[PDB]
C-alpha cells in the first residue's frame, strides 16, 4: 500500500512480486492495474503481465484471466512458457460456461479456443486435460438438446417430442444419451397411440411398434426393459383387436 501512493516503478514491481509469492493476489491485482499500461515494454515485462494473469486465475476472476492470458500469448510470441499461457487462457475461458439450461454462447467460444489450442501445439502435458474439457463442454451441448426434446414429453406434446427426438438421434450421432432418447421417444409414441381417436389408432400403434423395435435392437438389455415390455404388450393387445 506504500507503493500505491509512491511512484517508484522498481519498488512497485518488487512489492508486487513479494505479494504474489506470499499469495496476496488480490492486492497484486490492484498494483498491476496501477502498472498495467505504465510498465509495458519496460524490462521484467515477461514476469510482468504473467503473474498479473495467474493472480487472476487463482483469485477466480476467470474472464480477466482469459483476457490477460490471451494478451500475453498474442504478445511475447517467443516466450519460454507460451504453451502454458495458451492452455491456461483456454481453460480459464472454458470454466465460464453456463449451465445447460441457459444460452451456451460461451460454450461454443470455449470449444473454439480449446480446439485452437489442440490444433496448434498438438503435443503437451496439457493435451489430456484440454480434451477432457472439450468432452464435458460437448456433453453440456448435448444435454441441452436432450432436455429441450424431453420438455415435450413432460408438457404432454407427444408428437412434438416425436419429431424433436428424431432430430437428436441423428444430429448427435455418438452420445451416451441415445438410449434415453430412444426410450422417451417410444414413450411418446405409445402415449399418443393409446389415447387416440378410433380412426387414427392403427397408424400410431405401428409408429410405436417401430420405436419399440428400435429400442430393443440398439440395446437388448435396456435399462427400461420391464416398462418397455409392458407397454409393448399393451400395444399388441390393442392392435390385435383391430386386425381384420
Amino acid at each position: 500500500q506504500k507503493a500505491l501512493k509512491n511512484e517508484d516503478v522498481a519498488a512497485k514491481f518488487e512489492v508486487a512480486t513479494k505479494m504474489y509469492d506470499a499469495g496476496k493476489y488480490n492486492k497484486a491485482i490492484r498494483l498491476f492495474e496501477q502498472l498495467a499500461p505504465t510498465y509495458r515494454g519496460k524490462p521484467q515485462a515477461e514476469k510482468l503481465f504473467y503473474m498479473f494473469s495467474q493472480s487472476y486465475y487463482k483469485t477466480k476472476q476467470y474472464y480477466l484471466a482469459g483476457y490477460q492470458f490471451e494478451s500475453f500469448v498474442s504478445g511475447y510470441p517467443r516466450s519460454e512458457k507460451v504453451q502454458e499461457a495458451a492452455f491456461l487462457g483456454a481453460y480459464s475461458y472454458s470454466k465460464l460456461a453456463p449451465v445447460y439450461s441457459l444460452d451456451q454462447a460461451d460454450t461454443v467460444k470455449a470449444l473454439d479456443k480449446l480446439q485452437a489450442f489442440i490444433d496448434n501445439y498438438p503435443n503437451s502435458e496439457y493435451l489430456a486435460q484440454a480434451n477432457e474439457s472439450v468432452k464435458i463442454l460437448n456433453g453440456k451441448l448435448e444435454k441441452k438438446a436432450y432436455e429441450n426434446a424431453k420438455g415435450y414429453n413432460t408438457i404432454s406434446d407427444y408428437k412434438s417430442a416425436l419429431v424433436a427426438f428424431d432430430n437428436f438421434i441423428a444430429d448427435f450421432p455418438g452420445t451416451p444419451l441415445k438410449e434415453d432418447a430412444l426410450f422417451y421417444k417410444y414413450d411418446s409414441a405409445y402415449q399418443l397411440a393409446i389415447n387416440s381417436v378410433p380412426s387414427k389408432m392403427e397408424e400410431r400403434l405401428h409408429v410405436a411398434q417401430t420405436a419399440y423395435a428400435n429400442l430393443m435392437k440398439y440395446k437388448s438389455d435396456t435399462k427400461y426393459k420391464e416398462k418397455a415390455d409392458q407397454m409393448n404388450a399393451r400395444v399388441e393387445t390393442d392392435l390385435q383387436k383391430f386386425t381384420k
Binding site: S101, L102, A105, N148, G151, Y152, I155, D157, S160, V163
Partner: protein
C-alpha cells in the same frame, strides 16, 4: 394565400379537391389560416395526394399539367394555378384466378371483395392482394401463408384494357407446403430454457402459420422476462424441396425487479399499497452461493413483498407464485403470508380511535387451473386459508369479546370465464363471469354443543371472579365467586349478588359470543358479471351486475361478525388488506354506505357492523377519445345503484342508493392506469341528521 386557380375540374368538385391536400392550404378565417405558406416538399407531396384522390375516385388517366405560383408584388400572397386532365371512368372486370388448387375460385372471389362494375382503385387491389400496413389483415397473401404455404408468390397483372374496363388476372404460384422442423431459442442468459419452450405456439411437426408466430411473439413479450421489442424470429435452413423451416427466437432479457403503487385518494385517504416484486425467482437454488446474486434467478416464479396501508391499517405481505406446478399442466400455485394491524374507524365521520385495535395473521395456499374444453376461457381457482384475529379493546359494532380471538379456516372455489375481446384495455364485446364460494367446515353438525341454550348454563352467567367483597347496589357486599345480576335503581346502575340462584342471573354476552365465534362457521357466495356490448361506432356500454351472500349453517350460532360486505367508495381495497369486501360505488366516500346500528338507546349508534346481502347494478357508457398506442386516454360515464343489508330477514332490494357521474381514464406504458372520476350521490349516508345528499367526490385512482 389565395392559391386555388384550378383550371379543369369537370367532375372532382373544388371543395373536396382542396380538402385532398393536407398541408399547403389557402387564406381563410381558420386558426391563423391553417399556417398557410410555402413549403416545397409539403407542396409536392400535397400534389401527389391530389393525384391520389383523383385515382381513388376512379381516374387513372388523371394528371397535373400546369402548376404555377405567382407572388403578388402589391398585396403579398401566392396564387397557385393547377391544371388537371381528368380522363375516363374505369370499371373492374373479369378478375380471374390462375394457379389455384388449394382454394376454389369462388372462395378467392369472395375473399377479394371485388365485383363486376366497381370503379377502378389500384390501391384497393394492392391492399387486398398484399396488406403492407397491417400484418394481421385478411388479405390473400395472408390466407396463403397462414396454412403453411410460405413459398407462395401472387402477382397481379393486366391482360386486356377495352371499353374503359380492365381485365385482371392473378398469377398464383403455390409451391411445397411448409413444416416446422427445428424451433429453438437463443439469448436467454438468466432465464432457463424450459420456461420459454412451454409457452410457445410454434411446435415441431405442425404446419407453418404466421398468425401462430405473431401470437407466440406476443406471448413471449407478455411473459414479463423479455423486452417486447427484442423478440425477433429468424427463418433458418429454409429448404424448398423437403418443406422444412427452422425458426430461431432471438431474445434479450429486460429485468426482474418492479415496484407497484396501486391505490387511490378520494377524500378518505391513501388506501394504497407498495410492492417490491421479483418475477424471475427460483426456489430450488435458494442455497446456491453463486446463483444468489440479486436473490436467485431462473424459473418464472414470482415473489413479492408488499406493504398496504391507510390512515387506519398497516398490512405486510409476502407472496410466492409458480405459473406451472409439477411441470406438466398450467396449474398456477400461489402462497401468501400476511400480518395486518387495524384500528377502529367510522367511515361516515372520519375518526381514528387508536386504543381499539385488532390484528390479522393470514396464510393462504391456492391452485388455479385453466380447465380444458367445456369451452375455453375458463379458470377454476381453489384455495385454503387460515386466519387469526387477535382483538385489543375492540368494543365496536356487533363485537362483544373485545379482548379475545377468533380463528378462520376456509376453502374457496371459484369459476371465471373471460371472453373480453379484442383490445385488452378497451373491450368491444365479450363477457366476464365470476362465481366464487367460500365454505368453512360445518362444526355445528359434529360437536355436541347446543348454541340456542348456551346462555342458560352456569358457566356463562356473570360468575364474578372478583375476590373483593366491597359493596353492592342492594346494600349487600358481593360475596366473591358468586353469581350476580345488574339491577339499576333510581338513576344509577349496579349489581346484586344472588348466591346459588344462577337460573335468575345475567348472561355474559361476551363469553357466549366468544364461544359462538371461537371458530368461525359460515358460507359466502360472490357473483360478478360484465356484459360488454356494442352500440353506435364509439359508444361502449358496460354492465357490472353483482351479488353477494353470507350465512351460517346453524341459525342459532348466527352470522359471523367477520368477513362481511361493505358498500361505498372506490374499489381499490381488497380482502388482502382487511377482512372486508369493499363494494364499489363512486358517488359516496369510501365504505360509507355500510349499515349501522340504528338503535338510538344503544350506547353505540354510528358504528358500522357490516352487510351480509348486497346487490349492485352499474351501467357505463364509454367513448374511446384518444385510443392509441403508448397512451389510451378515454372517457366514461356512470349510472350505478347499490343496496346492502346486514340481515336477509326484511331485505328490500328496491332502495338502491343511486350515484351518477363521469370521468376519464389515462393509461401509460409504465405509469399504469391512472384516473380521475367525479360523482354525485343521490341518497343520504346512513345515520345522518339531515337528509340532503353527498356531494361531488374526487376519486383519484392509481392502478409506478
Amino acid at each position: 394565400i389565395s392559391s386555388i386557380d384550378f383550371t379543369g375540374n369537370k367532375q372532382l368538385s373544388d371543395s373536396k379537391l382542396r380538402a385532398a391536400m393536407k398541408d399547403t392550404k389557402q387564406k381563410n378565417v381558420l386558426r391563423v389560416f391553417k399556417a398557410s405558406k410555402f413549403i416545397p416538399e409539403k407542396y409536392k407531396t400535397d400534389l401527389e395526394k391530389v393525384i391520389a384522390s383523383y385515382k381513388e375516385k376512379g381516374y387513372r388517366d388523371a394528371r397535373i399539367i400546369y402548376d404555377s405560383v405567382i407572388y403578388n408584388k402589391k398585396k403579398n400572397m401566392l396564387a397557385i394555378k393547377i391544371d388537371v386532365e381528368e380522363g375516363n371512368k374505369y370499371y373492374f372486370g373479369n378478375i380471374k384466378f390462375l394457379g389455384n388448387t388449394v382454394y376454389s375460385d369462388q372462395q378467392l372471389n369472395r375473399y377479394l371483395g371485388i365485383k363486376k362494375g366497381e370503379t377502378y382503385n389500384g390501391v384497393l387491389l394492392e391492399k387486398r392482394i398484399a396488406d403492407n400496413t397491417k400484418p394481421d389483415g385478411e388479405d390473400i397473401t395472408n390466407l396463403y401463408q397462414n396454412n403453411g404455404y410460405l413459398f407462395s408468390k401472387i402477382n397481379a397483372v393486366e391482360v386486356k384494357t377495352v371499353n374503359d374496363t380492365i381485365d385482371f388476372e392473378i398469377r398464383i404460384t403455390e409451391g411445397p407446403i411448409a413444416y416446422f422442423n427445428k424451433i429453438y431459442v437463443t439469448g436467454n442468459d438468466k432465464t432457463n430454457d424450459h420456461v420459454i419452450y412451454r409457452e410457445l405456439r410454434t411446435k415441431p411437426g405442425n404446419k407453418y402459420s404466421k398468425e401462430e408466430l405473431v401470437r407466440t411473439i406476443r406471448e413471449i413479450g407478455q411473459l414479463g422476462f423479455f423486452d417486447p421489442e427484442s423478440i425477433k424470429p429468424e427463418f433458418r435452413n429454409v429448404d424448398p424441396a423437403a418443406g422444412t423451416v427452422d425458426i430461431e427466437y432471438q431474445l434479450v432479457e429486460k429485468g426482474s425487479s418492479q415496484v407497484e403503487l396501486q391505490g387511490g385518494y378520494g377524500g378518505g385517504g391513501f388506501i394504497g399499497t407498495l410492492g417490491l416484486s421479483f418475477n424471475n425467482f427460483s426456489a430450488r437454488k435458494l442455497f446456491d452461493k453463486d446463483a444468489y446474486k440479486p436473490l436467485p434467478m431462473g424459473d418464472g416464479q414470482k415473489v413479492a413483498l408488499r406493504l398496504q396501508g391507510s390512515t387506519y391499517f398497516q398490512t405486510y405481505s409476502l407472496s410466492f407464485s409458480e405459473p406451472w406446478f409439477g411441470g406438466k399442466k398450467p396449474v398456477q400455485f400461489s402462497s401468501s403470508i400476511s400480518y395486518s394491524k387495524q384500528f377502529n374507524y367510522n367511515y361516515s365521520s372520519r375518526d381514528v380511535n387508536r386504543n381499539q385495535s385488532f390484528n390479522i395473521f393470514t396464510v393462504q395456499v391456492g391452485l388455479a387451473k385453466r380447465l380444458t374444453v367445456p369451452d375455453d376461457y375458463f379458470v377454476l381457482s381453489q384455495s385454503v386459508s387460515y386466519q387469526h384475529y387477535d382483538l385489543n379493546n375492540y368494543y365496536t359494532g356487533l363485537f362483544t369479546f373485545g379482548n379475545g380471538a377468533s380463528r378462520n379456516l376456509a376453502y374457496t372455489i371459484g369459476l371465471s370465464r373471460s371472453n373480453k375481446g379484442v383490445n385488452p384495455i378497451f373491450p368491444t364485446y365479450g363477457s366476464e363471469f365470476s362465481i366464487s364460494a367460500k365454505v368453512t367446515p360445518p362444526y355445528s353438525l359434529f360437536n355436541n354443543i347446543n348454541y340456542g341454550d348456551l346462555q342458560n348454563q352456569k358457566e356463562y352467567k356473570t360468575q364474578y371472579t372478583g375476590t373483593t367483597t366491597t359493596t353492592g347496589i342492594d346494600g349487600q357486599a358481593i360475596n366473591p365467586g358468586d353469581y350476580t345480576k345488574t339491577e339499576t335503581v333510581n338513576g344509577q346502575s349496579g349489581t346484586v349478588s344472588v348466591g346459588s340462584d344462577y337460573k335468575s342471573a345475567d348472561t355474559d354476552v361476551g363469553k357466549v359470543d366468544q364461544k359462538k365465534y371461537n371458530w368461525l362457521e359460515y358460507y359466502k357466495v360472490k357473483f360478478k358479471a360484465d356484459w360488454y356490448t356494442k352500440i353506435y361506432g364509439k359508444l361502449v356500454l358496460r354492465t357490472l351486475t353483482e351479488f353477494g351472500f353470507l350465512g351460517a349453517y346453524d341459525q342459532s350460532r348466527g352470522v359471523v361478525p367477520f368477513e362481511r360486505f361493505y358498500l361505498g367508495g372506490d374499489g381499490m381495497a381488497n380482502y388482502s388488506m382487511d377482512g372486508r369486501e369493499t363494494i364499489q360505488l363512486r358517488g359516496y366516500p369510501n365504505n360509507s354506505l355500510t349499515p349501522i346500528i340504528e338503535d338510538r338507546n344503544s350506547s353505540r349508534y354510528g358504528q358500522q357492523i357490516g352487510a351480509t346481502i348486497y346487490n349492485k347494478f352499474s351501467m357505463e357508457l364509454r367513448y374511446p377519445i384518444t385510443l392509441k398506442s403508448s397512451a389510451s386516454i378515454y372517457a366514461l360515464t356512470f349510472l350505478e345503484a347499490g343496496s346492502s343489508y346486514p340481515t336477509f330477514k326484511d331485505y328490500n332490494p328496491f332502495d338502491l342508493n343511486r350515484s351518477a357521474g363521469a370521468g376519464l381514464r389515462v393509461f401509460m406504458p409504465a405509469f399504469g392506469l391512472l384516473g380521475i372520476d367525479f360523482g354525485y350521490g343521490f341518497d343520504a349516508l346512513p345515520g345522518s341528521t339531515t337528509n340532503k345528499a353527498n356531494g361531488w367526490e374526487t376519486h383519484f385512482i392509481i392502478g409506478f
